[PDB]
Amino acid sequence: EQLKMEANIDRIKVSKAAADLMAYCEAHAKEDPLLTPVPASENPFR
Amino acid sequence: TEDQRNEEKAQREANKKIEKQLQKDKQVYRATHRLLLLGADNSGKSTIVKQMRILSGGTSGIFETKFQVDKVNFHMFDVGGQRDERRKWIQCFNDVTAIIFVVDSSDYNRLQEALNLFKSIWNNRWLRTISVILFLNKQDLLAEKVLAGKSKIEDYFPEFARYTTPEDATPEPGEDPRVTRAKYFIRDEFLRISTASGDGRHYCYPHFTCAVDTENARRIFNDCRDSVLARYLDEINLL
Amino acid sequence: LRQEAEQLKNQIRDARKACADATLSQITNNIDPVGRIQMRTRRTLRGHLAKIYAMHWGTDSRLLVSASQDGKLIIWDSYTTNKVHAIPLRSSWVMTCAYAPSGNYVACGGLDNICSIYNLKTREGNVRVSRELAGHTGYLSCCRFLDDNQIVTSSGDTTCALWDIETGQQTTTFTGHTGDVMSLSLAPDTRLFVSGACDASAKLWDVREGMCRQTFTGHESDINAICFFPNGNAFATGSDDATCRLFDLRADQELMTYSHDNIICGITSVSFSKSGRLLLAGYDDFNCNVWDALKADRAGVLAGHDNRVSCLGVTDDGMAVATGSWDSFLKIWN
Amino acid sequence: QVQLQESGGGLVQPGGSLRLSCAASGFTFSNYKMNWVRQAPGKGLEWVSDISQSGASISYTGSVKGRFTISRDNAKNTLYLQMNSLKPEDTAVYYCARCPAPFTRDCFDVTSTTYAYRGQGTQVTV
Amino acid sequence: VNFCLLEVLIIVFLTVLIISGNIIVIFVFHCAPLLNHHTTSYFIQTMAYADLFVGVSCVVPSLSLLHHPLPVEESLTCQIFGFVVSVLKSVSMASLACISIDRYIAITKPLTYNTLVTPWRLRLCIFLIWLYSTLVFLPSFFHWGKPGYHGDVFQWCAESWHTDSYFTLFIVMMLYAPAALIVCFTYFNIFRICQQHTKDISERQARFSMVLFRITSVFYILWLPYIIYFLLESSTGHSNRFASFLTTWLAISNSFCNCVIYSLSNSVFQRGLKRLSGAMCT
Fold this sequence. Notes:
The structure holds 5 protein chains of 5 kinds. By secondary structure, chain B is an alpha/beta fold. Helices cover 44% and strands 16% of the residues of chain B. A 6-stranded mixed beta sheet of chain B has the order 2-3-1-4-5-6, with helices on both faces. Chain D is mostly beta strands. Chain D has one domain. Helices cover 0% and strands 38% of the residues of chain D. In chain D, a hairpin with a 4-residue loop joins β6 and β7. By secondary structure, chain E is mainly alpha-helical. Chain E has a single domain, classed as Rhodopsin 7-helix transmembrane proteins (Rhopdopsin 7-helix transmembrane proteins), CATH 1.20.1070.10. Helix content of chain E is 78%, strand content 0%. Chain E starts with a helix and ends with a helix. The chains are: A mainly alpha, B alpha/beta, C mainly beta, D mainly beta, E mainly alpha. Chains in contact: A-C, B-C, B-D, B-E, C-D, C-E. At the A-C interface, α1 and α2 of A face α1 and β17 of C. Chain A: One of its GO terms (cellular component) is membrane. Chain A: It is found in: Cell membrane. Chain A: It is a lipid-anchor. Chain A: One of its GO terms (molecular function) is G-protein beta-subunit binding.
């Protein structure tokens, strides 16, 4: 049951996963509002 | 534009009407006292529900009971339909006025489970504030089941033999001393858990409750008085 | 047997461990720090009677819903600080709320074990309940909208369920868990979702088949909140063991822990930023903390509450971060 | 991954003294508080023994209070329940129950049938 | 004013610190959200408004001491100044009274508290405080004596004006002595209840083997020699000059003292002060 349920799925490389996570953080970093703070009128809470 | 001004005026009217409705419900929520009922099943939750129904509502899952005494209304929540584990939905009962706790007096084997339940209530991080009313239910059947004999408390609780009666209110148990030593041991055994730790911010209010005890809603009333009054006496020094 | 299969799974996990040479912060040590991230209460939506226990944002990232155990369901406006509606509720005990991407409907998961679904934009303009989804026996911990019509609902009867509203029956049942399933987050691609339970484990389910695709058991206690990584290959878990952890699907192995010895209270809520550098964790020691996701360092504190932080929600665009607590006060943060 | 296996137990002579162990892995053993819970046939679950995170404070159920003993070895990461002067009704399945939270005096371990942090259990016989 | 400082320095040092404490307590009450959850902290906000206004009034005679820039006849101009303080300090006085009644309600019928102290009756209490504090001392406008010895450096009241003792007796039997009676009655019953409760709870615990009063006591000991010496100099018509001026300034000092004492008294106010200081330092 659990053996056939978990057995089939592949285990990809952790270094590849860390590189992918780093790329996913870096690519959308320019439009990141809290990571890169906004202009005071552009920040709609202001 | 003028339409933006109209939208802002509409939002102002809506927030004013909603704040008016919430301000009207604030007083009725603050006035009414909420009461968690907890306990085992053989401990007569249902019979004391029937006594407050001596004194529609959603019976799906939780049961509700309304009763008012002396122009103060208590609304009292029985957690019926919920599953047995209680580590998480007992966090939801934080701001309640008092945790009523009901114990079957007669059968000594589940008393240890009730004691562990009380200890779990007392030391919980979110339940440390709340005063715990204590009820010891079916008090007559305890007396019959000890006076019939052949059922040793001593086997379950060995510290009963090295125990004596400290004090009592005598005429009600005036037929017998050994039932007095029994029931007052049960009180003392809960109160060892109660006075175990803390800073005196929540208190245990035990009552020896029979099946036929009519006015015991008023005992709930007066010890809600004691809990709220002690809360206010701490509130003087707190602010 | 089953124990030999568990040893085989430990062998495959050790193979993934051999694939895992160094830590992610060890890998991204060439990338420099995020830096300090201060924040301030840009607005303070006050107006609840009792403890705010869960909130949800809108997909406009402008309107939001909060729910408290007084029996009020309040739609706040973040920009004007005005409450659009305040639905009075039949039962007071409410453990979650959810807000449709279409914006028409609001869900109210309660401890009465009935989910309620409300329509906001009604023809008459007076707000009533549309339907009452009733198939659960335990309390309802979390619920989220799959679409406008499909809704996923976790509960304390250890089973999730996927529902359609006008039909009124459980389309799919999700029964793998042993502990009470208490958090869930759903992916942006929406065909797969995740759920953590009180048994220190997260299952990820395909929403069509309704079966546990993957199981992760890194944690040590109850798991209070879970959240997908934005680009969809990972998720973070906030759990009562006072540790937070980042888990991956493709590697099928946990990557990152988020722990400091001085803080001891359990994580209550968790959320991500849009970019995913910036992880946000509510807490019982009264202050939200905010972590660099890829260095596991405490970037900052967002402390403005007097009681435990129940709920924590980031906007879609990623500017504002709403937070509620048991002090009945909801606050919008940067 | 959390891990609990019991060891020891089975049949012994009725007056005998029987030693049991519980191994715990996947967490810091130090901060949690341990319980033993026994299941007699045709019964519900019952809490039997309690010991804190420190091991300085300790508590016993009333029946086997003067009779049995419980010990923790946090550095060795093991739990032990020794039975002394056994009595024939005490035969049961002896689960090792881990408390849910750390740094926490209260627990809600003894439940209906299901619980995350119980061990699988071993059965002792008089 | 070549050597005016040897008497004016007390007034300057009092007034600056009084306004500073008022502003600090005002901001501390405003920033903390759950401070307003209690009913009493509304009255501390009332004291804070009275404290800021009393500090502004103190700043007025300070500017009179050297500059005299405004219309400086002071036959009425300084005179009505005394009216202000005779209202405003007494406003703070009546604040204590209604607070005591508040806590007395919370001791007497403690469940029905929230039905008898509605906030509408709370705004009615605050409006009757300001109205009555105006209304008692108003006939100082009507040429029948002034109730204050504040700002006695004003030489016009030092020479022309004399106390009418019937006016003095009417105002002390009208406003001062009801405040004293109400406060003593409330704290008599409150410490009765509190000590009775304390011994019972400790006896139950051993059987299984008042910052509002501090604020009140500070205010009453600080205002006590002013009323006593006020009655004396009303009674005989004999002045002790430096004693009268020091007594009046010390009576003024209570509004300065209350904010700092409440700062030390509540650690929740200390936490609000810590959060506000971390914000204002940033």
